[PDB]
Design a binder for this molecule. Structure first.
Ligand code: HEM
Length: 151
């Protein structure tokens, strides 16, 4: 369970993200796809993209990054009380999009990396640790839903 102090560190840096949702979403998905190409293959929308420049030029990718970060922000602001938000997300990702938990670990690493690059003054080690804990909680709770469903 995150402490109040940990949630403050998480939401302080997240408020900085929300100033440029789309640019963060691009950086994060591109890092994900470059660092873990298996993840790109899960996206019929995006698997035609073969270079970083093509990824950065795709408006559809930018739109999707906004969708992803908007959902994540809504979850983070619940400070753990996110059951209702995770239900549909876990269901779609387990049963329709077929995303392993490990790939959620990979996107978490990309989120952390981009936050560090964009917001170093609000993302020192204490804040990095807190954000890691928040994304771990996210994964833990999705994984329990995956297990219920047999994924
Ligand atoms: C922070 C973690 C993530 C969040 C918050 C998130 C959120 C979302 C949201 C809100 C949607 C649209 C509604 C829905 O279908 O549930 C979606 C769609 C989708 N997600 Fe995620 N997602 C996450 C991680 C991932 C990862 C790591 C992958 C793949 C490696 C993935 C693959 C997909 C796919 C394939 C779709 C459908 C895209 C389409 O064709 O329109 N998601 N995600």
């Amino acid at each position: 369970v995150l402490s109040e102090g940990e949630w403050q560190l998480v939401l302080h840096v997240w408020a900085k993200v929300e100033a440029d949702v789309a640019g963060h979403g691009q950086d994060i998905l591109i890092r994900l796809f470059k660092s873990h190409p298996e993840t790109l293959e899960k996206f019929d929308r995006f698997k035609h993209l073969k270079t970083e420049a093509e990824m950065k030029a795709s408006e559809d990718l930018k739109k999707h990054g906004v969708t992803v970060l908007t959902a994540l922000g809504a979850i983070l602001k619940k400070k753990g009380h996110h059951e209702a938000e995770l239900k549909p997300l876990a269901q779609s990702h387990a049963t329709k999009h077929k995303i392993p938990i490990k790939y959620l670990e990979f996107i978490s690493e990309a989120i952390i990396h981009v936050l560090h690059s964009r917001h170093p003054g609000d993302f020192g080690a204490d804040a990095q640790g807190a954000m890691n804990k928040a994304l771990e909680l996210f994964r833990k709770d999705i994984a329990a839903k995956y297990k219920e469903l047999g994924y």
